[PDB]
Amino acid sequence: GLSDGEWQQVLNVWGKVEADIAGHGQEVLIRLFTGHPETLEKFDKFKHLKTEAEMKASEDLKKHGTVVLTALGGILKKKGHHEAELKPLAQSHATKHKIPIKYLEFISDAIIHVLHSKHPGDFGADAQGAMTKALELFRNDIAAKYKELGFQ
Ligand code: HEM
């Protein structure tokens, strides 16, 4: 549950992402894959990437970063009223991709890391607080659907 002022902060931060969605999406995925190499194993189309230089040179990885961040932005713009947008992603991630909730925690923290790395000094404590709460709400609502499905 976020206040109106907290949502305003989230959507202000998101404007930074929308100015370069592919660059942010690429770096989020690279932070996830290099920090948590077990996550790469869930992607048949990226498991061939051995080095970060290959990851950085991969245009398909940047393309997938755009898909991921476009979906998250659509959810965030609903300001919590995201049941219809979130349900298919919870279902595909539990039943087809088999993504444990832990990996959604990993990517949430990676988003925070990338925002500080690309906007140092311009991602304030209030903005971090609100973005973190928004990602927690997203993860928590996914977790509820995972429990419904019995997925661990
Ligand atoms: C911000 C969180 C995330 C968002 C919004 C997101 C969004 C999406 C979207 C829109 C798709 C394509 C449609 C679909 O299959 O449902 C996708 C595919 C996928 N997601 Fe996620 N995802 C997230 C986190 C993750 C994480 C943490 C992993 C694994 C560590 C992951 C693994 C996958 C895989 C394996 C695919 C299929 C890729 C393919 O082979 O083309 N996702 N995701």
Curated annotation (Swiss-Prot):
Record bears the keyword Translocase: no
EC identifiers of the protein:
1.7.-.-, 1.11.1.-
Record-linked PANTHER family? MYOGLOBIN
Globin domain residues are 1-147
Q: What class of enzyme is it?
A: oxidoreductase
The species this protein was found in = Equus caballus
Q: Which gene underlies this protein?
A: MB
Query: What is the protein's name according to its record?
Result: Myoglobin
**Residues with PTM Phosphoserine:** S3
